[PDB]
C-alpha cells in the first residue's frame, strides 16, 4: 500500500528557521497515504466546549480516530507550541522530521523511538525531560488507544476561575488539563466548592505553568 496508510500527522514549527521543509514533508506524507491535520490533533477528540454546560468531562476520542492506528507530531525539536503541548497531553509521539525520511528509506513505518524528541524543559527541575509513550499496539486504533488512555491527572478535580481574546488562551489550559485526564469545572468564584486544586491564571491554588510542568513530566506534580 502507501506507507503512511493509517498514520495521522501534525507538523509543528519549525522551532528554528529553515530547520525542516514543512511544506515539503507535509506533501511526502500525503503522497504516501498519510493524513495531515493542519490544526493539530484536536480533531481526534470531542470539543468540550460544544455545549459548554456541565461542566466539563475530560476528552473522548471522536469516532473518526477509529480509522487510524498511529499518530505523530513532527517538530525539529521540543517546544511549547500548542500542537506540541497537545501531543504531549494526548501522549502522542513528538518526533524529529528525520523519522519520516527514514520511513521512506525502509519503505515502511519504522519505530519512531530513535526520533523521539525530549518532552521539554522543566523550570521546576531546571532540566530537559524525556517523553514516555505507551507503545503503539497495532491492533488497536487510535480511537481504541486514546480511549483507554487514563491521563496522569486522571480523576483529579480542578476548579478554573475565569471565550474571547485572552479567554482563548485560558481555555487552552483547560483543554490540556482535560486532555491529561482531569475533570475541570469552570467557576467565576470558589466559594465553598470541593476540589483537588484550583487553577487561576497567573502567579490549593496554582497557575497554568503547573499544567505545562505536568505535560512535560507526564505526572501530577502536586503529589
Amino acid at each position: 500500500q502507501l506507507i503512511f496508510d493509517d498514520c495521522v500527522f501534525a507538523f509543528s514549527g519549525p522551532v528554528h528557521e529553515d530547520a525542516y521543509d514543512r511544506s515539503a514533508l507535509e506533501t511526502v506524507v500525503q503522497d504516501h497515504g498519510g493524513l495531515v491535520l493542519d490544526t493539530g490533533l484536536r480533531p481526534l477528540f470531542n470539543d468540550p466546549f460544544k455545549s459548554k454546560q456541565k461542566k466539563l468531562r475530560h476528552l473522548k476520542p471522536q469516532k473518526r480516530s477509529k480509522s487510524w492506528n498511529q499518530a505523530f507530531v513532527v517538530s525539529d525539536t521540543f517546544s511549547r507550541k500548542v500542537k506540541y503541548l497537545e501531543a504531549l497531553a494526548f501522549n502522542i509521539p513528538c518526533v524529529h522530521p528525520q523519522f519520516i525520511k527514514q520511513c521512506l528509506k525502509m519503505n515502511r513505518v519504522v519505530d519512531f523511538s530513535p526520533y523521539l524528541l525530549a518532552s521539554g524543559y522543566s523550570h521546576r527541575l531546571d532540566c530537559t525531560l524525556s517523553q514516555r509513550i505507551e507503545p503503539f499496539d497495532t491492533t488497536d486504533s487510535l480511537y481504541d488507544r486514546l480511549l483507554a488512555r487514563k491521563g496522569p491527572l486522571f480523576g483529579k478535580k480542578i476548579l478554573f476561575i475565569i471565550n474571547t481574546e485572552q479567554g482563548q488562551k485560558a481555555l487552552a489550559h483547560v483543554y490540556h488539563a482535560l486532555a491529561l485526564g482531569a475533570d475541570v469545572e469552570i467557576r467565576p468564584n470558589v466559594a465553598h466548592l470541593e476540589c483537588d486544586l484550583i487553577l487561576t491564571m497567573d502567579g490549593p491554588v496554582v497557575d497554568p505553568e503547573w499544567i505545562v510542568e505536568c505535560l512535560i513530566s507526564q505526572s501530577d506534580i502536586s503529589t
Partner: peptide
C-alpha cells in the same frame, strides 16, 4: 502556535 504560541510558544511559552
Amino acid at each position: 502556535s504560541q510558544e511559552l
